[PDB]
Design a protein around this ligand. Sequence first.
Ligand SMILES: CCCCCCCCCCCCCC(=O)O[C@H](CCCCCCCCCCC)CC(=O)O[C@@H]1[C@@H](NC(=O)C[C@@H](CCCCCCCCCCC)OC(=O)CCCCCCCCCCC)[C@H](OC[C@H]2O[C@H](OP(=O)(O)O)[C@H](NC(=O)C[C@H](O)CCCCCCCCCCC)[C@@H](OC(=O)C[C@H](O)CCCCCCCCCCC)[C@@H]2O)O[C@H](CO[C@]2(C(=O)O)C[C@@H](O[C@]3(C(=O)O)C[C@@H](O)[C@@H](O)[C@@H]([C@H](O)CO)O3)[C@@H](O[C@H]3O[C@H]([C@@H](O)CO)[C@@H](OP(=O)(O)O)[C@H](O[C@H]4O[C@H]([C@@H](O)CO[C@H]5O[C@H]([C@@H](O)CO)[C@@H](O)[C@H](O)[C@@H]5O)[C@@H](OP(=O)(O)O)[C@H](O)[C@@H]4O)[C@@H]3O)[C@@H]([C@H](O)CO)O2)[C@H]1OP(=O)(O)O
Ligand SMILES: CCCCCCCCCCCCCCCCCCCC(=O)O[C@H](COC(=O)CCCCCCCCCCCCCC)COP(=O)(O)OCCN
Ligand SMILES: CCCCCCCCCCCCCCCCCCCC(=O)O[C@H](COC(=O)CCCCCCCCCCCCCC)COP(=O)(O)OCCN
Ligand SMILES: *[C@@H](O)[C@@H](COC(=O)CCCCCCCCCCCCCCCCC)OC(=O)CCCCCCCCCCCCCCCCC
Lengths: 88, 390, 42, 618
Amino acid sequence: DYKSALVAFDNFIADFPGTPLKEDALFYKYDSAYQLAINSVPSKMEERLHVAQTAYANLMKYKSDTKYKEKADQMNARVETDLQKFTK
Amino acid sequence: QQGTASPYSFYGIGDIKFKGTLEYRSMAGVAVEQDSIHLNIENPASYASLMQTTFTVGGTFGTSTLKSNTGSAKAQRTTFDYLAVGIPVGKFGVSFGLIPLSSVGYKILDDNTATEGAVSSQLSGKGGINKVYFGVGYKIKPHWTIGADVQYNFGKITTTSIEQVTGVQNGTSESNASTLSGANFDLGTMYQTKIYKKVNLFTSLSYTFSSNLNSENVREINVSGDPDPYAYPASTTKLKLPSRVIIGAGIGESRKWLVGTTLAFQGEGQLTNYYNAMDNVRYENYAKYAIGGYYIPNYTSFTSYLSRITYRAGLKYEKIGLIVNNESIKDVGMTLGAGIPIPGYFSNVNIGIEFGKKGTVSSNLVQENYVNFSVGFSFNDKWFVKSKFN
Amino acid sequence: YVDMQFEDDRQSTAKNTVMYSDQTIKYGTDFVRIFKDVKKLL
Amino acid sequence: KYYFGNIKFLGNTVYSDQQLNRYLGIKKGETYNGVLLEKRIADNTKPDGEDITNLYQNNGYLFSKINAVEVKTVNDTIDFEIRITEGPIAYFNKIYVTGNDKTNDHVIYRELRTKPGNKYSKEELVRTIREIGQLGFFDPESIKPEFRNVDPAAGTVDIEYQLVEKGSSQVELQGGYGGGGFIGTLGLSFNNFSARKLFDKDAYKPLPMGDGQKVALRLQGSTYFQTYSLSFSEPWFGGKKPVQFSSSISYSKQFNYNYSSRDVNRNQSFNIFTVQVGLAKRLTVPDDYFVLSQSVSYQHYDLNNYYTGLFTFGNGASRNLAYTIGLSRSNKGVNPIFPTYGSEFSISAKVTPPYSLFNNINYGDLQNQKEYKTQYTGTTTTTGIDGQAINPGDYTKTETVNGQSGTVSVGSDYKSADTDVGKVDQKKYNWLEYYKVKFKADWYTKIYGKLVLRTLTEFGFLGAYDQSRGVVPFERFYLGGDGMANYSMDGRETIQLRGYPNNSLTPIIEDRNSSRYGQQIGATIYNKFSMELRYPITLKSSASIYALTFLEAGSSYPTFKDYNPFDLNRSAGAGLRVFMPAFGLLGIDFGYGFDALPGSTTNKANGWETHFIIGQQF
Ligand SMILES: CCCCCCCCCCCCCC(=O)O[C@H](CCCCCCCCCCC)CC(=O)O[C@@H]1[C@@H](NC(=O)C[C@@H](CCCCCCCCCCC)OC(=O)CCCCCCCCCCC)[C@H](OC[C@H]2O[C@H](OP(=O)(O)O)[C@H](NC(=O)C[C@H](O)CCCCCCCCCCC)[C@@H](OC(=O)C[C@H](O)CCCCCCCCCCC)[C@@H]2O)O[C@H](CO[C@]2(C(=O)O)C[C@@H](O[C@]3(C(=O)O)C[C@@H](O)[C@@H](O)[C@@H]([C@H](O)CO)O3)[C@@H](O[C@H]3O[C@H]([C@@H](O)CO)[C@@H](OP(=O)(O)O)[C@H](O[C@H]4O[C@H]([C@@H](O)CO[C@H]5O[C@H]([C@@H](O)CO)[C@@H](O)[C@H](O)[C@@H]5O)[C@@H](OP(=O)(O)O)[C@H](O)[C@@H]4O)[C@@H]3O)[C@@H]([C@H](O)CO)O2)[C@H]1OP(=O)(O)O
Ligand SMILES: CCCCCCCCCCCCCCCCCCCC(=O)O[C@H](COC(=O)CCCCCCCCCCCCCC)COP(=O)(O)OCCN
Ligand SMILES: CCCCCCCCCCCCCCCCCCCC(=O)O[C@H](COC(=O)CCCCCCCCCCCCCC)COP(=O)(O)OCCN
Ligand SMILES: *[C@@H](O)[C@@H](COC(=O)CCCCCCCCCCCCCCCCC)OC(=O)CCCCCCCCCCCCCCCCC
C-alpha cells in the first residue's frame, strides 16, 4: 500500500516536527515512492520517478551521512536508469 | 439414460455423437473462420485465436421415429453433449475438455407371447466411447494458426439379449461387455486472407491420425433361478480408428456474413468387434459434404436487438460408411440456429434445431427421421490481467 | 452493515480449501446470535 | 389522481441527463407516487441501493445532495426538477482508530479499506465497518466512523473509527441440517491470541492477547460421528501479506451409519486422529484472483469391530500421510449468497507417498503365502466341523457339513488352506497410498433483469499408484440426496443430486452371494453437471430470499474401467432459499428423478423428492 504510505509519512514529518524518528520516516518515504514507481502504470511512471528523486534529496539533505546511504544510493541508480527511457 | 435409439448403433463403435459445438453444429460443422469467442474443438489451431477464457457446455433433446417395412415407432433421447475450456496464453492457446465420441443405444422387443412355446427376445444396448482432449494452438502469423492435440478414448459398450419362452417362467439373459481404451493425435491449421474489399477468404485443414483401440470382452450367460452363471473365457480384440482429413473453405465478411463448405474423409478402420460380426453388414470409408454459414444483420445496433443475433444455417450429406444388405447408409439433414449474445458480455446462448433422415426402408432396413433441439452456453471472461499501481 | 455479506478481496485472508473440516458450520444457525437478539427484545 | 410528467435534472455536470433518466426509470404518464421518487433518488433503507445518490457518493462526491422539487401542477400532471448538488471531490487524508484498549493498532489498520490518498467512497466505508465487525473484538452496534477535519476547499476528509472493545473470547453454538440428519457444533474461541508471548507468564490474562491469531477448541457431533479438535490460525502469516497459516489436532469417533435407513449400529465404529498444517496465500500472478492452498496431514485410523462393505480388517489400524495442493480462481460478486457475476474455478490434488515403488512387496502374491493363510493359533487339540482333530499350529479350511458350516483342518498343506482376507487387507491398507483429484467450475451470469443463470460442473477422481494394492477403502464419494459438507475426517464426500434419495446413486456390492450384497461400498469417480435459474425476491441484510429452478445430471462409478461420463441420472425441479444472519441458510427443494435407482428391477423413473437443508452443505 505504498500509495497510502506516502500520504501517511508526509503528514507525520509535518505533524511532529523535530523528532528523532525523522531520519527513518524520510527513508521509508523514499522507499514507498521507489517501489510505487518501479511497478506502476507506464502512463504515470515519470511522475512517480520524479517524486522518488525528491524524496532521495530530502533524505540526504537532512543527514548526509545517513545509515541507509548504501541502500539509498542503490535505489537512486534504478530511478536514474529508468528515467533515461522517458528522456524525450 | 442412453444417448441414441437407432438400431444402427449396434454395428461399429456406435453412432457418432459429437459433431461440433452448437455454434458450429448449427452450420453443418463448417468452422472455417478463426473465431475469438467460440471453441472449434475439431481443429486444434483455433485454440490460438481465442481472446478470452471460454467455458462451453451443451445439451440436446432428440426426437426420432424409426420406420421399417413392418411398422413405425417413436423414440426420444436427452443427453449432455460437451464440456470444453479454452485459455489464451500469449500467442499460444490451450484447450481441454470432455466430448462423446460415440454412443450405443437401442431397445427392441420381439413380443411373441399369447402363443405357448414361443421365444420372446428383448434386445438392448448401452454405453459408448468418450474422449478427453488437450490441445495447444500457436499463432505463426497474426492470421495464420497451427496446432496439435492429444485425445484419449475410453468407454464401455454392453449388449444384453434376454430370451424367455411363453410357457416357462425362467428365461436366459446373455450379456456382452467390452471396455475400449486408446489414444490418438490431431493436427490442424487455419489461414485467413482478404481477397476483396471487406471480404475475406477462410481456409482450414485438419488431420487426425489412425489409432489403435484395445477392447476387453466379457460374455456371460445367465438363466433365471440358476445361481451359477456360465462365463466364457476373457478375450482381447484390437480395433483401428480410421484417420480423418477435414478441408474447409469459405468467403465472407467478419461479423456480417459467411458462406463456407467442408469436406471430411476417413481412411481405413476396423470397428468390427466379436459381438457385432455379421455377414450382411460391411464397411466403407466415411465421407461428409456440408455447406453452411451465418448472417448477422447489424452486430453494432442500438435500436433493435434482433439484428445482433447470429443466424446460422447449414446442409449436410454424410456417408456413415456401413453397407447393410448391400445398401450404403447415408444421413441427410438441415440445421438452423441462432446465437443470442448476453448484453454487456461476450458470452452467448446458442439455440439450434436439426432435422434429417438416416437410413432407408428398402432392403428390409430401417429409416430414421429425427428432429433434434439443442441448447449451448458459451461463457467468455478475460483473465490474467495484471494490476499495476503497486 | 456488519450483517452484510461480501466476497473475499485482496485485503482479506486467504481461505484454505485443501484441508479437513474445522468443526464449524458455514451459514448455519447461530444460537448465540439468537440469544443476543432475544435479550434486546426484552 | 395525479400523473408524472416532465422530469428534468439540474446541476448534473458529471452525469448527463440521459444517464440519470435511465437510473431514475420514471416515464411520463405514470401515476404519481412520492415514495417511489424518493426511493429512486436516495434509498435510505439499504446502503447498497441503486439510487442516484449512491452513484455520486461512491465516486468521491461526499457533499452530494439530491432533492426533488415540484415545479408545475396542471391538468393533474405534476412536473419535477431534480436538483443535484455534486460538490467537490474529496480524498481520505488521515485515517485513525480510537477505543482499542486491548487490541493492537496493526491488527485494525490492516483491515481498513479506506486507504489515505484515495477518493471518498461510501462502499469502502461500509466494507470497512463489515471487516472490523468480522474480527469480533468490538461491538457490532458501535462501529461508528466519524468524519473529522472536513475541508471542502482542500477536498480532504479525515475518518476516525470509534470502536468499543467487548472481549476477544467467544462461544460458538451452531447447528445445521444436511445429509438427512442434524449436526451441531459447540466450541470456545480466542480470536486475539498471541503465540509470541506464549512463554511469557507475565501476560497470561485469559490466554496471551495481542496479535489477531485465533485458537479454538470446538466439538462437533451428529448421529454417526463426534469430533473434538484444537485449531490455531494465523490470518496474516509473515506480517506482510494476508497469508493464512492454520494447524489442527482432532480426534473423531465415526460409527457405522446406513444413510438409506438412517440407522446407526453403535457396535461398529472407528477412531480417527488427525494432525494437519496448512498455508494459503493469494497469488499476484497470473492475476490477483488466484489463491494457492497447501496442506500436510497425518491420520491414524483405529477400527473397532468395523466389519462393513470392503472393510475386512475390522480390528486393525491404518495410517495416512498426504500432501494436498489446490489452485482456485474466484471473481464472483458481490453478495456471496446471491452472486450476479463472476466465476469460480478450483482444482485440487491430494497425493500420498508411493510406498509400493520402494518397498519390495508383491501385493498380488500375498494370498499365496503361508503368512496370509488361515491357521489355528490355539495350543489345545480340538475337533473341526468335519469331526476330525485340529492340532495346534495346523492350517485350516472352511467346509459346510450338512446345514451348518465350519472350519476343517487341512494339515500342513498351506496351499489348500483358506486365505486370510483380513491379514491381506491389513498389509494392503496399513499405509494409505492413493491420489485424489477434484475439479469444480461455477459460472454466474445475468440473463434478463434480476434473473441470473448458474452453471456448475464438478469432477472427482480417486485412484491408486499400484493396481495390485487396490484402491483405499476411505476417501470415497457418495452421490444422491440433499448432500452434506465434508464434516467427517475420513475423507468421505457426500454429493448432492436433487430428485433422488440420500446416497441412492452410490455403487453397491453386486456379488449377490458375497454375504454383503446390496451394501454401498463407495465410488471412486463422480461427475455432476447442474444448471440453475435464480430470481431474487429480497436481498436485504436482514433476510435474503431467492427462488431457483434446476436441471441436474450426475453419476458415480466404482472404477475407471466403468467410467461413462455421459451416462448420468437426470433430474429437474425448483426450490426456495432463505438466508437470515441469526438462523443461517435455509433451503427447501423439490426435485423429480427421471431415472431409476441402481439395482432396480423395473426401469421406472424415481419420481418426486423433497430436500431440506440448513447451512452450506456443499
Ligand atoms: C497425464 C495426466 C495424469 C495422468 C497420468 C496417467 C498417464 C500415465 C500412464 C498411466 C498408464 C500406466 C498403466 C500401468 O502400467 O500402471 C498402472 C498404474 C498407473 C499409476 C498412474 C498414477 C497416476 C498418478 C496421477 C497423479 C495425479 C496428480 C497399473 C497397471 O499396470 O494396470 C494395468 C492396466 N492399466 C490400468 O489399470 C490403467 C488404468 C488407468 C489408471 C490411471 C488413470 C488416471 C486418470 C486420472 C487423471 C484425471 C485428471 C483430471 O486404466 C483404467 O482404469 C481405465 C482408463 C482410465 C480412464 C481415464 C478417464 C480420464 C477422465 C478425465 C476427465 C477429465 C492394463 O490395461 C491395459 C492398458 O493399460 C493402460 O490403459 P487401460 O487400463 O486399458 O485404460 C495403458 N496406458 C494408459 O496410458 C491408459 C491411461 O489410463 C491413460 C491416462 C489418461 C489420462 C487422462 C488425463 C485427463 C486429464 C487431462 C485433461 C486435459 C493402455 O495403453 C493404451 O492402449 C492407451 C494408450 O495407448 C496409452 C497412452 C495414453 C496416454 C494418454 C496421454 C494423456 C492425454 C490426456 C489428455 C488427452 C493399455 O492398453 O492392464 C494391465 C494388466 O496386465 C497384466 C498385469 O497386470 O501384469 C499383464 C498382462 O500381460 C500382457 C503382456 O505381458 O504384455 C498385457 C498386454 O500387453 C497383452 O499383450 C497381454 C496378452 O493379451 C495376454 O494374452 O499380455 C496380462 O497378464 C498376462 O501376462 C503374462 C505375460 O507373460 C503374457 O503372456 C502371463 O504370464 P506367463 O504365462 O507366465 O508368460 C500371465 O499369465 C500368468 O499369470 C496368470 C496368473 O497365474 C497370475 O495371477 C494373477 O496375477 C497377474 C499379475 O500380472 C498381476 O500383477 C494378473 O494380471 C492375472 O490376471 C492373475 O489374476 C495366469 O493367467 P490365466 O491364464 O489363468 O488367465 C497364467 O496361467 C500365468 O501363470 C497373463 O496371461 C494381464 C492379465 O490378463 C489381467 O488379468 O495382466 C495392468 O498392468 P500392466 O501389465 O503393468 O499394464
Ligand atoms: C492446471 C494446473 C497447472 C497450472 C500451472 C500454473 C502455471 C503458472 C504460470 C505462472 C505465470 C507465468 C509466468 C510469467 C507471468 C508474467 C506474464 C507473462 C506471461 C505471458 O506471456 O502470459 C500472460 C498471461 O499468461 C500467463 O501469465 C500464463 C498463464 C498460466 C496458465 C493459466 C491457467 C492456470 C491453471 C488454471 C486453469 C484451471 C482452472 C482452475 C483455477 C499474457 O501476457 P500479455 O497479455 O502481455 O501477453 C503476452 C504477449 N506479450
Ligand atoms: C501436481 C500435484 C502433485 C505434485 C505436487 C506439486 C507441487 C507444486 C509446487 C509447490 C507449490 C509452491 C510453489 C509455487 C508457489 C510459489 C509462488 C509464490 C507466490 C507468488 O507471488 O506467486 C508468483 C507466481 O506464483 C506461482 O508460482 C504461480 C503458480 C502456482 C501454482 C502451481 C502449482 C500447481 C497448481 C495445480 C494444483 C492442482 C494439480 C491438479 C493435477 C511468484 O512471485 P514471487 O514469490 O517470485 O514474487 C514476485 C511477485 N510476488
Ligand atoms: C414423461 O413422463 C415426462 C415426465 O413426467 C413427469 O413426471 C414430469 C417431470 C417433472 C417436470 C419438471 C418439474 C419442475 C419444474 C421446472 C422444470 C425445470 C426447468 C429448468 C429450466 C431452467 C434451467 C435451470 O417427461 C418429460 O417431461 C420429458 C422432459 C424432457 C425435457 C427435454 C428438454 C430439456 C433440455 C435439453 C437440454 C439439456 C439441458 C442442459 C442445457 C445446458 C447444456 C449443458
